[PDB]
Amino acid sequence: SMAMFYAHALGGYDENLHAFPGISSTVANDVRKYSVVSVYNNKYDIVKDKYMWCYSQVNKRYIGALLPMFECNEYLQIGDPIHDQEGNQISIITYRHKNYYALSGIGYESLDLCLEGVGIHHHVLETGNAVYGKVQHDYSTIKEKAKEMNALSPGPIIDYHVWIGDCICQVTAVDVHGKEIMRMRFKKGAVLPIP
Amino acid sequence: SMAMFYAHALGGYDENLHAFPGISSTVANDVRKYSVVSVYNNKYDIVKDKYMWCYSQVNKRYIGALLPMFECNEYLQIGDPIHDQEGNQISIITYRHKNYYALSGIGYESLDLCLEGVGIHHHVLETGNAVYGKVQHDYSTIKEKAKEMNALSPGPIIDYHVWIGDCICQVTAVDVHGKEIMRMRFKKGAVLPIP
Ligand SMILES: Nc1nc(=O)c2ncn([C@@H]3O[C@H](CO)[C@@H](O)[C@H]3OP(=O)(O)OC[C@H]3O[C@@H](n4cnc5c(N)ncnc54)[C@H](O)[C@@H]3OP(=O)(O)O)c2[nH]1
Ligand SMILES: Nc1nc(=O)c2ncn([C@@H]3O[C@H](CO)[C@@H](O)[C@H]3OP(=O)(O)OC[C@H]3O[C@@H](n4cnc5c(N)ncnc54)[C@H](O)[C@@H]3OP(=O)(O)O)c2[nH]1
Incomplete structure (x- = not known):
C-alpha cells in the first residue's frame, strides 16, 4: 500500500504513525543514506557534513532531530513530495533555511521531550x-x-x-x-x- | 609545559581540568581524528564505525561519551599513556571490553549529568x-x-x-x-x- 506522509504544520500529527520532525508517516525512511534527492523532475545534492536542527511541537510532544539538507534555489511548498533516484517518495518538504531544505525521516541525533511543565x-x-x-x-x-x-x-x-x-x-x-x-x-x- | 592526564579511577578528578570519561587532563585532545595509536611502542588500529560507551561518576557528576576504541591483545594497565604515531601522548588507558580499549578525550556523542537525587x-x-x-x-x-x-x-x-x-x-x-x-x-x- 502507498506510503503516506502527513505534515504536522497542516495538523497531520498521528500518534499511531512514525514521528519525525514535521512529519507523521506510515513508513520509516532512513534518510541518512541519500546523497541526491528529487522534487518535481529536479535533482538536488545533499549537503555534506552540515545539517539542519528541525523540530515540531504537537500534542505536548517535542520532536527534534539533526536532518540532512539539500540546496535548492527554487521555492518549494510545504508538503511537496521528495523522491529518491528510483521514483519512490521518501519524505515531504518541511523546513527551510534560505536555500537549504531539510530531508525529514530517520535522520541523525535526535531529541524528544514531554513538554508539559518544562x-x-x-x-x-x-x-x-x-x-x-x-x-x-x-x-x-x-x-x-x-x-x-x-x-x-x-x-x-x-x-x-x-x-x-x-x-x-x-x-x-x-x-x-x-x-x-x-x-x-x-x-x-x-x-x-x-x- | 607537559600535558598531564589523571585517572579518575585513581582519584584524579579535578574540577579545574578538562573532563572526559575516566580522565581529567590539562589538555583537550580531539581523539576522533586518529585511526592508529601507540601503547609501549606498539601500534593498534582504531575500530571503524563501532565505539565504546564509557562513563565515570566522580563528585556527584556523571561524565559519559561514545569513545573510539582500538583492538589490543596485550594487557594494558589503567593509566598507561596512549600515544599517536609521532610519539605524543594523547590519552591514557581507561576502559576495556575484552580486547578493545577506549581512547578517551574529546570524542563523539556525550552525556553529562548531576547524579544527586536521580x-x-x-x-x-x-x-x-x-x-x-x-x-x-x-x-x-x-x-x-x-x-x-x-x-x-x-x-x-x-x-x-x-x-x-x-x-x-x-x-x-x-x-x-x-x-x-x-x-x-x-x-x-x-x-x-x-x-
Ligand atoms: N521516530 C524515529 N526517529 C529516529 O530518529 C529513529 N531512529 C531509530 N528509530 C527506530 O525506528 C523504529 C520504527 O521505524 C523504531 O524501533 C525506532 O526505535 P525507538 O526510537 O527506540 O522508538 C520506539 C517508538 O516509540 C515512539 N514514541 C515515543 N513516544 C511516543 C508517544 N508519546 N506516542 C507515540 N509514540 C511514541 C517513538 O516515536 C518510536 O516510534 P515511531 O517510529 O512510530 O515514532 C527511530 N524512530
Ligand atoms: N569535556 C568535554 N567533552 C566533549 O566531548 C567536548 N566537546 C567539545 N568540548 C568543548 O572543548 C572546550 C574545552 O576543551 C570546551 O569549550 C568544550 O565545550 P563545552 O562542553 O560547551 O564546555 C563546557 C565546559 O564546562 C565543564 N563543566 C560542566 N560542568 C562542570 C562542573 N560541575 N565543574 C567543572 N566543569 C564543568 C565542562 O566539562 C566543559 O569544560 P571541560 O573541558 O574543562 O570539561 C568538549 N568538552
Whole structure:
C-alpha cells in the first residue's frame, strides 16, 4: 500500500504513525543514506557534513532531530513530495533555511521531550563559545560559572536549551537557579530553520 | 609545559581540568581524528564505525561519551599513556571490553549529568528492539506502551536509562510512573565496558 506522509504544520500529527520532525508517516525512511534527492523532475545534492536542527511541537510532544539538507534555489511548498533516484517518495518538504531544505525521516541525533511543565529554547551557538546551562561564553567564563554552581544542590529541571553551532550541537537542562542538570553533545555542525 | 592526564579511577578528578570519561587532563585532545595509536611502542588500529560507551561518576557528576576504541591483545594497565604515531601522548588507558580499549578525550556523542537525587542505569540494547522509558521491546509493544502512557501527566525525572546497541544508542529519562520524559538518540553502534 502507498506510503503516506502527513505534515504536522497542516495538523497531520498521528500518534499511531512514525514521528519525525514535521512529519507523521506510515513508513520509516532512513534518510541518512541519500546523497541526491528529487522534487518535481529536479535533482538536488545533499549537503555534506552540515545539517539542519528541525523540530515540531504537537500534542505536548517535542520532536527534534539533526536532518540532512539539500540546496535548492527554487521555492518549494510545504508538503511537496521528495523522491529518491528510483521514483519512490521518501519524505515531504518541511523546513527551510534560505536555500537549504531539510530531508525529514530517520535522520541523525535526535531529541524528544514531554513538554508539559518544562520550557525549551533554541539558540545559535557562537563559534568558540562554551556552554553551561542557559548561557554561552568563552571557556574561562563558563568554567568559573560551572565551579560556582557546584556548591548548589540540584533542583528539578524547568527549562531545556538547544545550542546549534557550526561544529557542534548541545542540549542542556537547568533548574530554577540556572544550574546545569544535564548536558548532551551532538558532534555535528548545523543550522536552525528560518520561518 | 607537559600535558598531564589523571585517572579518575585513581582519584584524579579535578574540577579545574578538562573532563572526559575516566580522565581529567590539562589538555583537550580531539581523539576522533586518529585511526592508529601507540601503547609501549606498539601500534593498534582504531575500530571503524563501532565505539565504546564509557562513563565515570566522580563528585556527584556523571561524565559519559561514545569513545573510539582500538583492538589490543596485550594487557594494558589503567593509566598507561596512549600515544599517536609521532610519539605524543594523547590519552591514557581507561576502559576495556575484552580486547578493545577506549581512547578517551574529546570524542563523539556525550552525556553529562548531576547524579544527586536521580539514578542512572545501563542496558545492552538488543538488536531489533525499540525503547520506551525503562523498557525495550519489539516495535508494536513499545508503541502500545507509549500510547497507554500518553494519558498520564508527566512527573519529575527520577531515573535515566542508557541503551547501548549494535546500530544505535539512546538515553531516556522516566518519572515515577515509568512515563518517558525525555529521549535522545545517538546514531552510532557501541559496546559497554567490562569491569
Ligand atoms: N521516530 C524515529 N526517529 C529516529 O530518529 C529513529 N531512529 C531509530 N528509530 C527506530 O525506528 C523504529 C520504527 O521505524 C523504531 O524501533 C525506532 O526505535 P525507538 O526510537 O527506540 O522508538 C520506539 C517508538 O516509540 C515512539 N514514541 C515515543 N513516544 C511516543 C508517544 N508519546 N506516542 C507515540 N509514540 C511514541 C517513538 O516515536 C518510536 O516510534 P515511531 O517510529 O512510530 O515514532 C527511530 N524512530
Ligand atoms: N569535556 C568535554 N567533552 C566533549 O566531548 C567536548 N566537546 C567539545 N568540548 C568543548 O572543548 C572546550 C574545552 O576543551 C570546551 O569549550 C568544550 O565545550 P563545552 O562542553 O560547551 O564546555 C563546557 C565546559 O564546562 C565543564 N563543566 C560542566 N560542568 C562542570 C562542573 N560541575 N565543574 C567543572 N566543569 C564543568 C565542562 O566539562 C566543559 O569544560 P571541560 O573541558 O574543562 O570539561 C568538549 N568538552
